[PDB]
Amino acid sequence: KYSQDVLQLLYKNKPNYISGQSIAESLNISRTAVKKVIDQLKLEGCKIDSVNHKGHLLQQLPDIWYQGIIDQYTKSSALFDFSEVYDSIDSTQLAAKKSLVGNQSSFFILSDEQTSKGQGLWMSVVLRPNVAFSMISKFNLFIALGIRDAIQHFSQDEVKVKWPNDIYIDNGKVCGFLTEMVANNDGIEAIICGIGINLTQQLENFDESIRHRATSIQLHDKNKLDRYQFLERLLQEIEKRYNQFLTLPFSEIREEYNAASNIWNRTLLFTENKQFKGQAIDLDYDGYLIVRDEAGESHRLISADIDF
Numbered sequence: 001k002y003s004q005d006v007l008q009l010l011y012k013n014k015p016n017y018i019s020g021q022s023i024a025e026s027l028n029i030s031r032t033a034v035k036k037v038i039d040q041l042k043l044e045g046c047k048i049d050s051v052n053h054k055g056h057l058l059q060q061l062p063d064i065w066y067q068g069i070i071d072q073y074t075k076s077s078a079l080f081d082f083s084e085v086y087d088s089i090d091s092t093q094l095a096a097k098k099s100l101v102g103n104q105s106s107f108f109i110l111s112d113e114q115t116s117k118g119q120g121l122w123m124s125v126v127l128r129p130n131v132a133f134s135m136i137s138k139f140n141l142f143i144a145l146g147i148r149d150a151i152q153h154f155s156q157d158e159v160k161v162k163w164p165n166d167i168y169i170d171n172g173k174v175c176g177f178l179t180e181m182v183a184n185n186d187g188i189e190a191i192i193c194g195i196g197i198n199l200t201q202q203l204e205n206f207d208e209s210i211r212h213r214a215t216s217i218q219l220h221d222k223n224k225l226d227r228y229q230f231l232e233r234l235l236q237e238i239e240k241r242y243n244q245f246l247t248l249p250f251s252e253i254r255e256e257y258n259a260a261s262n263i264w265n266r267t268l269l270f271t272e273n274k275q276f277k278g279q280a281i282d283l284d285y286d287g288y289l290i291v292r293d294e295a296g297e298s299h300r301l302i303s304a305d306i307d308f
Contacts, residue, residue: 009026064087
């Protein structure tokens with residue numbers, strides 16, 4: 001809390017040094033508190049340069065989520081009223097669903113760990129779309145492109161979408177999301193989008209049973225993946241695709257969605273409600289997957305489980 005305010009102050013002030021006294025004064029705490037807090041942050045892995053007569057300089061954040069720096073992202077955000085950041089919790093979705101009750105806030109929840117030391121981004125986003133029930137199902141289509149785009153800025157390899165809720169880089173799943181909705185006696189109370197992304201896993205950090213079809217962003221980034229740089233881009237794409245969702249028909253992102261998909265030209269296993277094999281041949285204007293089975297019968301699925 002002292003921790004965050006100092007860190008936030010430090011982050012803000014980059015690339016300038018600021019004195020223990022300035023911090024003391026800006027924050028209104030004892031100069032000794034600032035000393036304990038500076039060492040505390042370094043202890044936690046913050047690379048802070050401290051030089052006599054000049055003060056302190058945040059040089060690099062570690063692989064952990066800091067409330068005080070995430071706050072800077074949401075201050076410049078039209079959409080997100082705030083974020084909650086946790087070290088560890090069971091399910092960001094459960095927490096999101098609990099937090100949205102009794103308010104109309106838009107916000108998100110991050111956790112370093114959702115029960116590979118901090119190699120994933122677990123985030124649930126709570127949104128308040130005043131939309132019809134007829135537009136709900138297209139949300140996944142818009143947001144998938146947002147996630148695909150953000151991840152692609154960091155990957156030297158082509159990032160693709162697997163309908164409805166997985167993101168792949170080549171043959172490995174790099175992201176999976178889930179969208180849940182909450183309604184009242186009247187209509188849609190909120191959307192909760194749960195987003196799991198593999199940030200910096202090495203192949204060894206995935207279980208063997210799964211390794212040949214998992215990947216992380218870092219495996220396709222020749223450069224060190226900066227988790228904060230990625231979060232910033234991901235929130236930007238999310239907000240952008242959200243505004244599209246509110247304003248545009250799916251038909252307008254349909255071709256882009258098609259060009260960004262890895263499900264074409266191969267026989268897949270489809271499971272809805274239950275199972276059959278065929279080829280996905282189109283996404284219609286309404287966001288339904290058009291599928292041709294091995295008995296040649298065309299099917300129209302709003303949501304199915306596509307399994308390679």
